[PDB]
Structure 1
């Protein structure tokens, strides 16, 4: 449907906006880009599904998200990856975990306030019909 395509274009606009706001926050800089192999060669070993905000943007533009739920699974992934890979009591680990939780909480709070529930329901219904 043209009406369905207008729905998804609006979804993408919404997601790019939320993602930009996360990406510009200083606390979240470490999540803006993939991890550099040279600097962290064991990351790829421990972390089987790397995710970051740059990859999120690419996926939005490739039309990979048909719902906000699907987007939020990638945000959750950014966070869970960080908790898994940096699990120690050390302060560098604690800082990154704190920041990962803040990224997740912030994405959820923005969505809670700004996503129309009927809009999401529509996306989910279109997705479920394909």
Structure 2
């Protein structure tokens, strides 16, 4: 229905706004763009599902997210990819992991404060209906 399409458009608006706020945070710069294979040629072979905030924005616009839950799965992927690819005790790796965990915690906390739980429940019920 058109009311359903208004619901998902509000969802996309909300997700673009949250994603923009993460993308402009200097700590998260490394997660704003896909890894360059010309820097890291083994990335694409170690990490099977690369994910970054630029790709998240593209997916919102392609209507790939019908719930905040499916958006958060991609935030989680950004974070777990960074933990998996950079697992060493040295400071370069520790810094990336700290930032990856901060990216995830920040996204969850914005959503906890600003997403209405009845709005998410509606999205889930429309999605489940399709």
**Same topology, TM > 0.5:** yes
1:27 Cα shift? 0.1
1:33 Cα shift? 0.1
Compute the RMSD of aligned alpha carbons: 0.2
1:70 Cα shift? 0.1
Q: Which residue of 2 aligns with 1:75?
A: 75
1:44 Cα shift? 0.4
Aligned residues: 130
Note the residue ranges of structure 1 that are not aligned, 5 or more in a row: none
Deviation string 1:63-118 (CA, Å, 9 cap, x unpaired) is 00000000000000000000000000010000000000000000000000000000
1:57 Cα shift? 0.1
Structure 2 CA distance for aligned equivalents of residues 39 and 25 of structure 1: 23
Note the residue ranges of structure 2 that are not aligned, 5 or more in a row: none
Deviation string 1:5-31 (CA, Å, 9 cap, x unpaired) is 000000000000000000000000000
Structure 2 CA distance for aligned equivalents of residues 21 and 124 of structure 1: 24
Q: Which residue of 2 aligns with 1:55?
A: 55
Structure 1 CA distance for aligned equivalents of residues 47 and 72 of structure 2: 18
Q: Which residue of 2 aligns with 1:105?
A: 105
1:32 Cα shift? 0.0
Structure 2 CA distance for aligned equivalents of residues 80 and 20 of structure 1: 20
TM-score normalised per structure 2: 1.00
Segments ≥4 residues shifted beyond 2 Å: none
TM-score normalised per structure 1: 1.00
Instruction: State the SS of the aligned residue for 1:78.
Output: helix
Structure 2 CA distance for aligned equivalents of residues 114 and 38 of structure 1: 39
